[PDB]
RNA sequence: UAUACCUCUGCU
RNA sequence: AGUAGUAACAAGAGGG
């Protein structure tokens, strides 16, 4: 959620991610989980850097400019991940930064 | 552009942008597994520093005992072990010349210390790893196991209540040779049920005797694991824990130092962060004061590699007897005792290893006492080698390690040793054209070497590093440097012309600390508090500290404003309580209340701040004294939380007791194992010690001391207590016999 | 530039 | 004088020289050779795009998943979703499926 | 041997 | 697969 300049509120949502089972004891323990996320970006000019994705293409996208609209294609960059209690505990302190 | 934060230190010094370069807001490094492999590193390059010693076979445990002190003195830079005695010696008698009385009145409160502790005394303090089990335990545990089991043998003096008692008690039981212990097994019962016939787990124990050796090595036994969450560095390290028979040994010895380091201006030890850096300050007034206008003077950010693993029991022995001299003989052998365990200690080698098969799919564990036996097919080469050396080393099941020392064994005595050479620096003593003076703790020091000319100090370098290295002081050639005197660098405090603020070590006490919501605000306010004092926390950040610790605080415990639309399984109580309430500015926030705090009220507890404020009927709910929610501790542990900044001291915040001073569950993993019981155990002595307490009201402020049985001692009690209730009070004569007659029923069932 | 490819205008 | 005895007894191999600091005379770190080093996020950075909707909720509040439906209901032009970047190491159709 | 279930545990 | 990193997680134990 966040606020424009405008002052307008909003609710964004980026994708989503799919928790595995999470039978967490010891504080290094993993969860599974998958993200879904969206992007226009084109993972083939940086191959590279999406060494552990899965890119699919979903759709299309009529998007504003100045004074004229452009089509680009809506990619979903997929990959399996995992955290653990102690990574995921601080990562809900990041606050602190 | 590409932005790169390391070009501020074109303009900023590094020292006053120092915060950018700790990056403690990301979770720090812990281990996966086990700590095997740490612990046989540890114990294999312990013995190749001192492998130039001379090795011998215990007399009474039958392990290998590598001892490097005065041996051949060393011919290379690497770590060294080859301590010699004398020059120890000399270096004790040189602190003993420059403070007359020192010695003496640290060993009469040592005395006085020894002749009044009592045995309560170790259940206070960090875990300690428990021979009765094979495991680490609360030291309170540990301690009453240890006493059981020595009564159940021959072994009773500490029924006095004395801690001296205590000790004699375990250097008598190492003359058993069938010392017999209780161990619990789980059994496999078939019972019928309305109408089928099920299996039920049950745990019988079963009595073991054991070997003289068996003991002994149990006793000299100190466990090790892997040490999480350490910050600073790329591998991980493997730490210690003592055990019980040396735990009251050691707790005199390091008193003993402790009295030593406490009146040594040299020594870091055991003062805090402000008075560091005060006890810095003064050597570099002193050392200006003390030198010339020709003179020069050159700091030593220092610091000594493989601290633990080079210094030696032996050594602690000969600096004990020394710093004892003259004392009676039965107090300098007492706190020998600690030395010498830790001469014959073993490491326990920890959990062991999991293997691992691709085509079958499948793991298994193997036991540390199993690398004795064991083919060596599984392992990866490294992993191969060390078990082919620590085979040599190995006796039932633990790797023997006479030689060096481990982090967590042992705290001060060692800083006693490195302030010594600080000591040696003085000008009457060396007399040369140098000199030199610092501070010191554990492995790390400044020195601060003054001279002539540069050529000077380069000599003094040497003379210091040579010294050190005659008494197994390694100083690091890679991680110390020097420059003239005006910076350096001591235990993460940075001084420019004066120490400067490292407030990023403290960010991550920045958050919910996670005992209640009581402690949890009071702790959190005070966090901020000090540090605006002692590390330059600006009046805006920390205000934006406040917001940020109130959102989360109201995030972690559900407990966000009574006006919110958020949406948890605590929104709609608090909603009432909302609506119900007049006053809603007296609503703590974990009632669903405003935040009261600013910069100015940091250091006033929630309740009191909103003590005016607060409805009535709320206020006598919120500080409700018959509420089931609170632990009634002793006052000793109130308002006590744990926090790791050292190895784990307690943190007392303010707070007023309410509803919300509650305790979280406990771990119940146990109930899955063979230790079940102790639940049991514990859910008894609770009861008796409630009990006890109604009786004596006071035992929850000052222990009671007395050799008399807790039943006898509530009987006296409660005799006159009916007598004086009624004979000049109000209560009945009918129930002044009620109540004897019942301390003769049960004076009778014994 | 031209559009935001974080906060597309669809 | 048993420490200057055994002062003059050590071999003078046992020192520690001072050799002065000059950053003009030093190197610049050696960094590693290897594969291209891969994105580990645990979700997009500046790859991110968002689907958002206008709404008056404060920072936390309202149903996640009825917030994203929202979100969602505010694009069309999916497409039927095809691969195009595989992870080498992936059954790719799980991800698709 | 396979498939359902059922119970305890999430720092011990 | 993935997390991860000097050894682990990718549920453990039981109703055998
Ligand atoms: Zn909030």
Redesign the interface.
């Given at each position: 959620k966040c606020r424009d300049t405008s002052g307008q509120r909003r609710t964004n949502l980026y994708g989503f991610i799919i928790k595995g089972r999470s039978h967490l004891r010891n504080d290094t323990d993993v969860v599974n989980f998958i993200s879904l996320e969206f992007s226009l970006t084109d993972p083939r000019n940086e191959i590279h850097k999406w060494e552990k994705y899965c890119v699919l293409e979903i759709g299309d996208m009529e998007i504003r400019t100045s004074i004229s609209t452009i089509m680009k294609p809506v990619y979903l960059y997929v990959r399996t991940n995992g955290t653990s209690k102690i990574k995921m505990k601080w990562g809900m302190e990041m606050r602190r930064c | 552009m590409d932005v790169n934060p390391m070009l501020i230190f074109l303009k900023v010094p590094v020292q006053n942008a120092i915060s950018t370069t700790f990056p403690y807001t990301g979770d720090p490094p812990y281990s996966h597994g086990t700590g095997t492999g740490y612990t046989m590193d540890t114990v294999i390059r312990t013995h190749d520093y001192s492998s130039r010693g001379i090795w011998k076979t215990n007399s009474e445990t039958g392990a290998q005992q590598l001892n490097p002190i005065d041996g051949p003195l060393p011919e290379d830079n690497e770590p060294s072990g080859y301590a010699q005695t004398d020059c120890v010696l000399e270096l004790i008698e040189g602190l003993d010349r420059s403070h007359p009385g020192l010695f003496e009145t640290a060993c009469q409160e040592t005395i006085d210390a020894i002749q009044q502790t009592r045995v309560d005394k170790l259940t206070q303090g960090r875990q300690t790893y428990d021979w009765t089990l094979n495991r680490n335990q609360p030291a309170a545990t540990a301690l009453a196991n240890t006493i059981e089991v020595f009564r159940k043998n021959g072994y009773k003096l500490n029924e006095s209540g004395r801690l001296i008692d205590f000790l004699k008690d375990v250097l008598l039981s190492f003359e058993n040779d069938s010392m017999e212990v209780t161990t619990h097994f789980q059994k496999k019962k078939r019972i019928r049920d309305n109408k089928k016939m099920i299996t039920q787990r049950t745990i019988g124990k079963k009595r073991v005797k054991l070997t003289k050796k068996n003991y002994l090595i149990r006793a000299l036994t100190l466990n090790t694991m892997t040490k999480d969450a350490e910050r600073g560095k790329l591998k991980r390290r493997a730490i210690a824990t003592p055990g019980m028979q040396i735990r009251g040994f050691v707790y005199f010895v390091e008193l003993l130092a402790r009295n030593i380091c406490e009146r040594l201006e040299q020594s870091g030890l055991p003062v805090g962060g402000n008075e560091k850096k005060a006890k810095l300050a003064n050597v570099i007034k002193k050392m200006m004061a003390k030198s010339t206008d020709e003179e020069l003077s050159y700091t030593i950010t220092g610091d000594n590699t493989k601290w633990n693993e080079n210094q030696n029991p032996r050594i602690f022995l000969a600096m004990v007897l020394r710093i004892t001299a003259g004392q009676p003989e039965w107090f300098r052998d007492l706190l020998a005792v600690a030395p010498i365990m830790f001469s014959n200690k073993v490491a326990r080698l920890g959990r062991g290893y999991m293997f691992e098969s691709k085509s079958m799919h499948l793991r298994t564990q193997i036991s540390a006492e199993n690398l004795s036996d064991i083919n060596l097919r599984y392992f990866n080469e490294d992993t191969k080698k060390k078990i082919e050396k620590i085979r040599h080393l190995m006796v039932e099941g633990t790797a023997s390690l006479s030689p060096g020392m481990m982090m967590g064994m042992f705290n001060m005595l060692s800083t006693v040793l490195g302030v010594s050479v600080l000591n040696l620096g003085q000008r009457e003593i060396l007399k040369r054209t140098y000199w030199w003076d610092g501070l010191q703790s554990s492995d790390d020091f400044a020195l601060i070497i003054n001279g002539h000319f540069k050529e000077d100090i380069q000599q003094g370098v040497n003379h210091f590093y040579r010294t050190c290295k005659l008494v197994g002081i390694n100083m690091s050639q890679k991680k110390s440097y020097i420059n003239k005197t005006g910076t350096f660098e001591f235990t993460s405090f940075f001084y420019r012309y004066g120490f400067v603020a490292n407030f990023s070590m403290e960010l991550p006490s920045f958050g919910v600390a996670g005992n209640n919501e009581s402690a949890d605000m009071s702790i959190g306010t005070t966090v901020i508090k000090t540090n605006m004092i002692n590390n330059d926390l600006g009046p805006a950040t920390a205000q934006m500290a406040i917001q940020l610790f109130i959102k989360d605080y109201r995030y972690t415990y559900r407990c966000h404003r009574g006006d919110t639309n958020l949406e948890t399984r605590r929104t709609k109580s608090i909603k009432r309580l909302w609506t119900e309430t007049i006053s809603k500015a007296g609503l703590l926030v974990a009632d669903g209340g405003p935040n009261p705090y600013n910069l100015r009220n940091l250091h006033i507890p929630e309740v009191c701040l909103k003590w005016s404020l607060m409805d009535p009927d709320y206020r006598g709910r919120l500080c409700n004294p018959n509420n089931p929610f609170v632990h009634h501790m002793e006052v000793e542990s109130t308002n006590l939380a744990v926090v790791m900044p050292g190895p784990a001291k307690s943190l007392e915040y303010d707070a007023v007791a309410t509803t919300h001073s509650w305790t979280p569950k406990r771990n119940r993993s146990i109930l899955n194992t063979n230790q079940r019981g102790i639940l049991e155990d514990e859910r008894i002595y609770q009861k008796c010690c409630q009990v006890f307490e109604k009786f004596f009201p006071s035992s929850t402020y000052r222990r009671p001391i007395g050799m008399a049985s807790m039943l006898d001692a509530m009987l006296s009690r409660a005799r006159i207590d009916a007598r004086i209730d009624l004979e000049s009070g109000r209560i009945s004569s009918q129930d002044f016999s009620e109540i004897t007659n019942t301390c003769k029923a049960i004076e009778a069932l014994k | 530039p031209?559009?935001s490819?974080?906060?597309?205008?669809? | 004088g048993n420490i200057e005895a055994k002062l003059g007894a050590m071999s003078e191999k046992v020192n520690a020289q001072i050799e002065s600091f000059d950053p003009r005379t030093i190197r610049e770190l050696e960094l590693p050779e290897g594969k291209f080093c891969t994105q580990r996020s645990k979700f997009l950075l500046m790859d991110a795009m968002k689907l958002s909707v206008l709404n008056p909720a404060h920072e936390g509040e309202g149903i996640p998943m009825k917030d994203a439906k929202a979100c969602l209901d505010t694009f069309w032009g999916w497409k039927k979703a095809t691969i195009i970047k595989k992870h080498e190491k992936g059954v790719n159709t799980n991800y698709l499926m």
């Open positions: - | - | 031209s559009y490819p974080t906060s597309p205008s669809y | -």
